[PDB]
Subunit: 167 residues, 3 copies
């Protein structure tokens, strides 16, 4: 039914190194900010843990175990707090972090919205079975990105992945 | 304590074919709508998934696997998002869907409010052990239905099933 | 990133026998009430279940199984509804109830804020490995209690236990 207050709490999973990825994430953020069903959005790369004992940290890049633990746990906490996952999913460069997180959320029985992106529509349209069956809602990033502004995250209606060859 | 905003998110479980069942559901919805502790109510039958490749689908009839998956997942998603379950539970015609959902929610450690209905109070008062022990709060549907309007769904105080013979 | 509404739902775990304990709980409650990230706070001892069939029940005495079940379940329900745990943790008299609840919440992947108190700073600073590693954020109760008023419970940033000997 119609929610009295917004209840949607989104875990936004995405790689964040290159341009386009960062641009995708930013646009996703604005779109979600326009959605009246959303109470909160968590994006892992926004904040960050600082290890006082960590000298000259990179990103390459050997990191302290304290930093690793704190950041990983910040992400798991984000998944725990979240009601649903929204993943900006690069089909050209598969991100195993995002896949890990999708599997994690599905094991918790939480709904997962997959938002796939490709710069090669001329190439074969294929998906790993675990992703294709694991995700509960697909919203195409190249053609339907704008739907993130209107999607009812209070209820997260299903939309099974179809039209992808499956391996 | 007193909630700053309503936090109650209800999964409302009930069969929805017959008259009476539908009436029960409607009254339940109104009562819950009057409750200030509730942020959201999900009722499985309100919306629906439409499989484009499904021609002339019948309730009770053979359904496509896509529709089955999407609908089942819509319910599981509702259970996931919910903080608690409220089941309009017909003691005269046992619904195994509702029982399934009760078990699912209890396995997730979520509280379950059972709202039993009978058209034969003069008849034997008996309940299956898994339901009687599984549910955390009982509110009699014939005599206490109205309590759905005032019950504090921010905290869901317990009220164990008593007065039922157990098999 | 920034919440549209507060989403923090706190399970406040603490013993409630001594005046010192009750005072800690009270101050904690007041501090949390000032936190704009918090939607709701649950404290187990605030309310109570009353077993009509229980004659002259005594705190610390033999309790009816109905009371035991209902009360235990009220706590588990509090943990279920909660997004995170905040534990007023007496390092001088270890409370196994609170520890139980911490383990329960961590098994559910929920974040746990430990707020340790000691009146014997002269003694060695030691912690059980399961508590030190189980907890996701430590806020010292003796020196940093007030931080409960400002902490962002929408996201619950990590802060690993350091400075304690580990046994
Ligand atoms: O720096 C990060 N690398 C990274 N790989 C996977 C998740 N994350 C993550 N979340 C927050 N910061 C980071
Ligand atoms: O609500 C309670 N929770 C709880 N955990 C451990 C003991 N207790 C306790 N004793 C009386 N009421 C309670």
């Amino acid at each position: 039914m119609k929610a009295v207050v917004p209840t949607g709490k989104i875990y936004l999973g995405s790689p964040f190194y290159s341009d386009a990825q960062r641009e995708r994430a930013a646009k996703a953020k604005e779109l979600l900010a326009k959605n009246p069903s959303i109470a909160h959005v968590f994006f892992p790369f926004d904040d960050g843990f600082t290890d006082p004992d960590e000298k000259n940290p990179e990103i390459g890049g050997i990191r302290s175990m304290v930093w690793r633990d704190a950041t990983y746990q910040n992400d798991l906490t984000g998944i725990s707090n979240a009601t649903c996952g929204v993943f900006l999913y690069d089909m050209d460069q598969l991100d195993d972090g995002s896949a890990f997180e999708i599997g994690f959320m599905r094991a918790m029985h939480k709904p997962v919205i997959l938002v796939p992106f490709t710069e090669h529509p001329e190439k074969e349209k294929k998906m790993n079975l675990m992703i294709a069956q694991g995700v509960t809602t697909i919203i195409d990033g190249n053609t339907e990105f704008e739907k993130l502004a209107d999607y009812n995250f209070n209820e997260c209606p299903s939309n099974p992945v179809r039209g992808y060859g499956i391996y």
